Amino acid sequence: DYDIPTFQGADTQKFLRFAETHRTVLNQILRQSTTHLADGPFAVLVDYIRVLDFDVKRKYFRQELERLDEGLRKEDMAVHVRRDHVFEDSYRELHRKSPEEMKNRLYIVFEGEEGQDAGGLLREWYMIISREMFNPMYALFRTSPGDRVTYTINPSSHCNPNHLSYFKFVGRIVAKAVYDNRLLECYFTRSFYKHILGKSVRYTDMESEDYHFYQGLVYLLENDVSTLGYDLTFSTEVQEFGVCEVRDLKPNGANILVTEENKKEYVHLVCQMRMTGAIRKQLAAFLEGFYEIIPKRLISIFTEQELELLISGLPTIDIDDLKSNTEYHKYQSNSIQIQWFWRALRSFDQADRAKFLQFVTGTSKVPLQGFAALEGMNGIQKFQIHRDDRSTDRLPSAHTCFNQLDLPAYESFEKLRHMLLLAIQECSEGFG
Amino acid sequence: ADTQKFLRFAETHRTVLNQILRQSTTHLADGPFAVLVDYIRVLDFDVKRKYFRQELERLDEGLRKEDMAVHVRRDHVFEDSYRELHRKSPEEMKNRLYIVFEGEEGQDAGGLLREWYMIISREMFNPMYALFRTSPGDRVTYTINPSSHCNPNHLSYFKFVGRIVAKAVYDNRLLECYFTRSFYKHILGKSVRYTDMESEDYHFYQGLVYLLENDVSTLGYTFSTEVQEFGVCEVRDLKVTEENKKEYVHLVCQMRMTGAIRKQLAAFLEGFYEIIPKRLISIFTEQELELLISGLPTIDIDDLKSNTEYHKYQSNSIQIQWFWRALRSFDQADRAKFLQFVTGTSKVPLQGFAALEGMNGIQKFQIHRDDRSTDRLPSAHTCFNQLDLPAYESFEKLRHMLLLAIQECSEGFGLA
């Protein structure tokens, strides 16, 4: 099933056997049933699957998912909706269904409309739902201030009296689309995909959600705590459901003072709280609906960048269009680092190109009107590359709210490609 | 070339998988990689060694092991140990030995047991017992002495020594027993290749290389060879065309190697396999079995580099810089496999690499340039401690090729 990449005389037959054993081993591990495995031993197997290419992991994902369908008697299931009320009608029709029922084959029927191809109607239906779930009138999701086209949970969702039930429904629909192997135009924030994967956010995630709070954190990290006229404690204010409250980051955080040894830890904890604190119940509802269909441990083989690609698909990126609409600061278009950069980017496969777009823009969503219409925090903001004048042993940094790449003056092409390629991959949970 | 991309993938796959299996606190069958037990032959040495010792403990778990005394004389350890242990049962041999030297001070039993194993391993090879003899080519490696029949009770002794080697493995205690590569193949039930003769009968090997490379009409000369078993000479039938040569060379080499010692081996293997199941030991290669019994050596590469000779190559040749870079990048097991590949053993000479011994006396490690096409592996000739190294185009290619050459077993590039 799974495929691997690709001497004279007696050595050729020796190599082909060597080559076949390696493939046999890989395939046997990936074909092996994992349903006897607990979460601990399964996570160990994930440390191996995680290193494989995206398409291999997607293929393993779909294999294991179908294995979870054993013991099910799948039926065709009708979803009756009105073209004017698709979202609320679909909620009524599906939100009380069981998880097992949701694995049935949906066929949509619009009230009193001419019978069309069921397959296309399902595609049409998904398209409408993915759009309406982000409609402000339901107050479930809101755009991030930084990246504009990405969404996360609206903390003021309690205006809608049924929101918790609706968040569970929306989580169910996202999982159902993945299950049905149908793409959605739902583009969430990087941090939101982390929530699904059960990963903590970094302070860098704050930049596109709450810009000024992010800056305060960077200042705290880069300077001594004594340079502040105020003291800090392991506690922060959170406004859940319109009710403000001071929650402790760690067990006695209100009496614990923020020292230099505590800074990195403080920043880590406070960001987690601010990001998920005002939305913890809406999020828990969403994840309940999601994990009902797609187990958490199973989706955890993907990285936050890849999960988006799983849900929304792999895009085709017109690099010429991007290059035509790139601005340069300190660098010029003909600077050696820039020529290397474009050569490196073109040398990336489809997945890594997408991961790069995610890395600098905050999403894999390509603007319909081309990269001349790339949106940022302050309006239309073209992709821009700045020279990083610090030492050349750091990775390229990004600031997605400006669609900005900070590129050090690397000494060689081999170094630039290697460093850039590392930067676009998943980051660690390290506090620094 | 697409082949090098595959080798690059394969090493990544090797490194990742094995590293996970090393951190594992589970048995391999109980864990998530349980499917691999059927492909245990392909994993790294230490991983197979962990599996080996775990499986060994699991199969005897139903046994109630007690402490067992062995009474010997410090001056007569070998023959006394034969008396105390050679008629004992396999289950008795799986008990915990504690040694008592006749009329000597009671010491730490763990330390005293390590001293008893080191002394018996040195005495197995004493010519006075006429059980083993050194190979002419590699000098420091041993195999069965065909003239073992001088003592008529020898088959009983071959079984005893086989038992002691296995017992040492069972007890997880290392021995200073260094056999020939061919001998380890015998333990694993593997056939020898014509290349193996080079260190056993140099002149015969030359005849075989000539026969293989040239036409049969260039000789002037049947599936039979002379064997001197038990001092009694005989021409034994193996089963001579150009089409049959492949077959002829294979059979005759088997015969010259195993013909005069076939019963002595069967006795040794009987003794060995009583303690250690054959299927379990067969997960190792001929190279690896030695490392299991004798341990992984630590190699001072600086000492080796200081005593390396170069022919056609110079010390500053780019392939030589790559070579040392490749060797340094190898883990302990692969470094050992390299030492085995070019010298014929993993035993580091006590007097340093400046005293490396060869067929015709003292011979330092030497690297020659192989001027033939660069699509072949590095070749070795262990009786000269010689590495034949092609002028490889890149470091990545040289390293990949060297790694394949030192891991090669008689079943190909790693066991099939």
Numbering used by the authors:
A (entry chain A): 3936 to 3941, 3947 to 4014, 4015A, 4016 to 4372
B (entry chain B): 3950 to 4170, 4173 to 4190, 4198 to 4374
Paper text:
The human ubiquitin ligase HUWE1 (also known as ARF-BP1, MULE, LASU1, or HECTH9) regulates the stability of diverse cellular substrates and, in consequence, numerous physiological processes, including DNA replication and damage repair, cell proliferation and differentiation, and apoptosis. HUWE1 belongs to the HECT (Homologous to E6AP C-Terminus)-family of ubiquitin ligases (E3 enzymes).
In contrast, the same region adopts a turn followed by short 310-helical segments in molecule B. The N-terminal part of the extension consists of a long amphipathic α-helix spanning 21 (3951–3971) and 22 (3951–3972) residues in molecules A and B, respectively, that we will term the ‘pointer helix’. Taken together, we conclude that the conformation of molecule B in our crystal structure of HUWE1 represents an auto-inhibited state. In contrast, we have discovered that the catalytic activity of HUWE1 is down-regulated by dimerization, as mediated by a previously uncharacterized region adjacent to the catalytic HECT domain.
